[PDB]
Design a protein around this ligand. Structure first.
Ligand SMILES: C[N+](C)(C)CCO
Ligand SMILES: C[N+](C)(C)CCO
Ligand SMILES: [Cl-]
Ligand SMILES: [Cl-]
Ligand SMILES: [Cl-]
Ligand SMILES: [Cl-]
Ligand SMILES: [Cl-]
Ligand SMILES: [Cl-]
Ligand SMILES: [Cl-]
Ligand SMILES: [Cl-]
Ligand SMILES: [Cl-]
Ligand SMILES: [Cl-]
Ligand SMILES: [Cl-]
Ligand SMILES: [Cl-]
Ligand SMILES: [Cl-]
Ligand code: NA
Ligand code: NA
Ligand code: NA
Ligand code: NA
Length: 129
């Protein structure tokens, strides 16, 4: 599924991301834009053999099991395929664990490089939430 920005903002709010760990909805929407272009089916393989999955590009190195990332963890206790669903629940629940682990949203490199410090409210401007 490819979301529009306001559709995704509304779904993220329903699933509890609005100001989760102090990060406003615009931060989460901005991260999703630059991680996945709002596409729940996005996958990207890293040079080291891990893979990033879904709307928030969650990495098999730590967070989900894909059976092909040697030495990795599965800290969200989920198959990585579950992070590719049209329903964003599994990705949101796993993202809550990631953002709570000490470094906030800096875990998402694209957020740090493209969203952090910017006018992220523009991502939710005009949206009926
Ligand atoms: C080690 N990380 C913090 C990157 C994830 C495991 O807690
Ligand atoms: C691209 N938008 C204008 C929708 C938000 C970016 O700031
Ligand atoms: Cl899709
Ligand atoms: Cl929209
Ligand atoms: Cl914020
Ligand atoms: Cl915002
Ligand atoms: Cl994801
Ligand atoms: Cl593995
Ligand atoms: Cl594990
Ligand atoms: Cl599994
Ligand atoms: Cl959803
Ligand atoms: Cl923080
Ligand atoms: Cl990470
Ligand atoms: Cl607004
Ligand atoms: Cl809207
Ligand atoms: Na957009
Ligand atoms: Na990424
Ligand atoms: Na893993
Ligand atoms: Na295996």
């Amino acid at each position: 599924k490819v979301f529009g920005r306001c559709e995704l903002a509304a779904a993220m709010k329903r699933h509890g991301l609005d100001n989760y760990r102090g990060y406003s909805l615009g931060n989460w929407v901005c991260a999703a834009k630059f991680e996945s272009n709002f596409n729940t089916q996005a996958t990207n393989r890293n040079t080291d053999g891990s893979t990033d999955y879904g709307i928030l590009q969650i990495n098999s190195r730590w967070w989900c099991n894909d059976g092909r990332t040697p030495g990795s963890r599965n800290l969200c206790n989920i198959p990585c395929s579950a992070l590719l669903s049209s329903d964003i629940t599994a990705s949101v629940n796993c993202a809550k664990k990631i953002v709570s682990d000490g470094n906030g949203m800096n875990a998402w490199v694209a957020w740090r490089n493209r969203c952090k410090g910017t006018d992220v409210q523009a991502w939710i401007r005009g949206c009926r939430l």
